[PDB]
């Protein structure tokens, strides 16, 4: 089991990207640095916020024994670099989606004959 | 058999929804308007993008007219339901039925 202590990595309710806890206030509230992205044009923003614990899920730990705000922004942009909003099939144009569909569909016709 | 074909044609091109009530208070009903829920639409902001779109109720067992047309007029509540108007008033016997959402806008006069 993980613990809620400075340097815990968390996700928020119905969200894909990671955020990090910075201070603990009481037995139910914390201060977090939060990452999010505008799907309108890849515009990111990272900012600090006070939150109740019933909206967050812990997943791991990092050191951050002493760091500045600009440093932790760096930690965060590295951490969630790989992640994405949506599966690309819904983002691409129609012909490209059909081309991707054919691959899967033909592969089944092979497998059902080969098995 | 034309009915079996007309269904498959509609199934491939429309979103799906169900009729569940007339517009009503605790005491009175307003049968000129009907309430619909659409399959994967679950917030009021999501639902706003359908206001203006055409809807059709298809009923093959009918002897008079095989389909009724209508239009989505407004959003209703906070969980993504909508309000619609049809060329004829919907009977209480037709509640629970499947409705088709047609992916193009029409004017209030066309119905």
């Amino acid at each position: 089991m993980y613990f809620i202590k400075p340097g815990c990595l968390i996700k928020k309710k119905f969200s894909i990207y990671t955020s990090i806890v910075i201070s603990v206030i009481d037995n139910n509230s914390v201060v977090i640095q939060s990452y999010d992205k505008s799907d309108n044009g890849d515009v990111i923003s990272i900012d600090r916020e006070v939150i109740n614990v019933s909206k967050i899920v812990p997943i791991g730990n990092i050191d951050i024994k002493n760091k500045s705000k600009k440093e932790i922004d760096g930690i965060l942009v590295e951490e969630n670099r790989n992640l994405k909003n949506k599966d690309d099939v819904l983002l691409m144009n129609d012909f490209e989606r059909f081309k991707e569909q054919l691959k899967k569909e033909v592969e089944d016709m092979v497998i059902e004959e080969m098995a | 058999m034309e009915v079996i074909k007309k269904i498959e044609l509609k199934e491939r091109v429309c979103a799906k929804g169900t009729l569940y009530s007339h517009k009503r208070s605790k005491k009175n009903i307003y049968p000129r308007y009907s309430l619909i829920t659409i399959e994967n639409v679950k917030t009021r902001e999501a639902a706003m993008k359908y206001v203006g779109n055409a809807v059709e109720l298809f009923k093959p067992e009918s002897t008079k007219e095989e389909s009724i047309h209508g239009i989505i007029k407004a959003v209703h509540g906070r969980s993504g339901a909508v309000r619609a108007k049809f060329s004829r008033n919907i009977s209480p016997v037709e509640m629970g039925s499947k409705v088709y959402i047609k992916l193009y806008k029409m004017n209030e006069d066309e119905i």
Binding site: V106, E107, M109, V110, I111, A115 | T18, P92, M95, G96
Partner: protein
């Protein structure tokens, strides 16, 4: 929508909360099958449940008991009557809706294979605090004369057999196909069929 069916595994849900969600679907035209009715959970000590049920048996029609209330003594039928009174059953629309519902203790053989749904908001471990007691409907109903407990234990053992067999049968095909598809003999024909579709 009329023409849609749904199968629900009742284990670990709080009775009065699931019943509200189910009743709404019946009014929208869905056919519902509930399985494992003997495992639904009520909150509080069993002691309180026993007193609420004793007060119910005391109720009867003064002049003719064959008109008066019928006190049902099976977990399936009890949960059925909880759902019944969350519908408009004195009118035709409620009587139509009720006939779309079936409830079973255990899992019958015709429903072993079918894939099954669940309701996260109504599960005990979400909707209640850990520090307080609860009981199962199967535990209350043995005290008021249910007579088919053992029949349900025998059913429950057939389910366990089917689960282990199906999972074992699946894991072999998963291994087989995933080991197969890495081969050249497979990856060759991809090209051979595509030559005729490109």
């Amino acid at each position: 929508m009329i023409g849609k069916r749904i199968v629900i595994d009742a284990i670990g849900h709080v009775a009065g909360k699931l019943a509200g969600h189910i009743a709404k679907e019946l009014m929208c035209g869905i056919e519902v099958v509930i399985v494992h009715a003997e495992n639904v959970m009520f909150t509080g000590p069993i002691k309180r449940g026993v007193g609420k049920f004793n007060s119910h048996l005391n109720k009867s029609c003064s002049y003719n008991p064959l008109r008066g209330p019928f006190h049902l003594r099976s977990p399936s039928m009890h949960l059925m009557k909880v759902i019944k009174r969350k519908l408009p059953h004195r009118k035709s629309k409620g009587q139509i809706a009720l006939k779309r519902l079936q409830v079973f203790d255990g899992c019958p053989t015709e429903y072993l294979s079918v894939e099954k749904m669940v309701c996260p908001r109504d599960k005990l471990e979400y909707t209640t605090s850990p520090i307080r007691k609860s009981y199962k409907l199967g535990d209350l109903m043995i005290k008021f004369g249910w007579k088919y407990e053992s029949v349900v234990e025998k059913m429950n053992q057939n389910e366990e057999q089917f689960k282990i067999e199906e999972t074992e049968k699946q894991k072999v095909k998963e291994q087989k196909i995933e080991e197969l598809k890495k081969s050249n003999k497979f990856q060759q024909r991809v090209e051979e069929i595509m030559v005729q579709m490109a």
